[PDB]
Amino acid sequence: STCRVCAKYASNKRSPKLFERSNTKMIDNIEALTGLRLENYGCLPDQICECCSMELASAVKLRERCIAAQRELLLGLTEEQRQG
Amino acid sequence: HLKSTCRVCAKYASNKRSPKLFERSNTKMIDNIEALTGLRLENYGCLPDQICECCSMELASAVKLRERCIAAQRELLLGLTEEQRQGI
Ligand SMILES: [Zn+2]
Numbered sequence: 001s002t003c004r005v006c007a008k009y010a011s012n013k014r015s016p017k018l019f020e021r022s023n024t025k026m027i028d029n030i031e032a033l034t035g036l037r038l039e040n041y042g043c044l045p046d047q048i049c050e051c052c053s054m055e056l057a058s059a060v061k062l063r064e065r066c067i068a069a070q071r072e073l074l075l076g077l078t079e080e081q082r083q084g
Numbered sequence: 085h086l087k088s089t090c091r092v093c094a095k096y097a098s099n100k101r102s103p104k105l106f107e108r109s110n111t112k113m114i115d116n117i118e119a120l121t122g123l124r125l126e127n128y129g130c131l132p133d134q135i136c137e138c139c140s141m142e143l144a145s146a147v148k149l150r151e152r153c154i155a156a157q158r159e160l161l162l163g164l165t166e167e168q169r170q171g172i
């Protein structure tokens with residue numbers, strides 16, 4: 001019934017389970033975004049809501065696009081322009 | 085192309101609707117980009133110096149989620165009784 005990521009209502013049905021040894025992707029993406037390793041505790045929620053899943057997928061895509069774009073722009077340059 | 089390129093996605097950017105990253109009004113965006121990616125982007129004459137509209141929107145949305153997630157972990161910990169909390 002509660003989302004571990006935004007602490008609001010979920011569904012306990014259409015809310016994916018964060019810790020299900022296969023969406024370790026989600027926990028990885030959360031740590032990459034926030035610098036927090038979320039741990040499975042009995043007294044905390046174990047679910048992510050659909051809205052949080054979607055925004056997380058979007059933020060990861062932008063992060064990867066941004067890193068790859070800095071390498072692509074670097075290659076577009078002449079060897080001289082390459083500095084710092 | 086430099087004038088019409090997004091520094092964040094390397095694709096076309098509308099000059100007039102692309103905020104200039106390295107100006108005082110936008111220093112928060114360089115920090116948001118570093119929080120998201122781990123990269124501190126730098127102002128060089130030979131690299132684009134604007135963020136396109138599409139990148140600005142997705143970046144704003146990524147920041148909101150980042151902050152909500154950090155604050156949600158605090159709020160769940162306070163939502164516990166002291167005996168529950170002794171766990172973390
Ligand atoms: Zn949520």
Ligand SMILES: [Zn+2]
Binds near residue numbers: 093094095135138
């Ligand atoms: Zn862009």
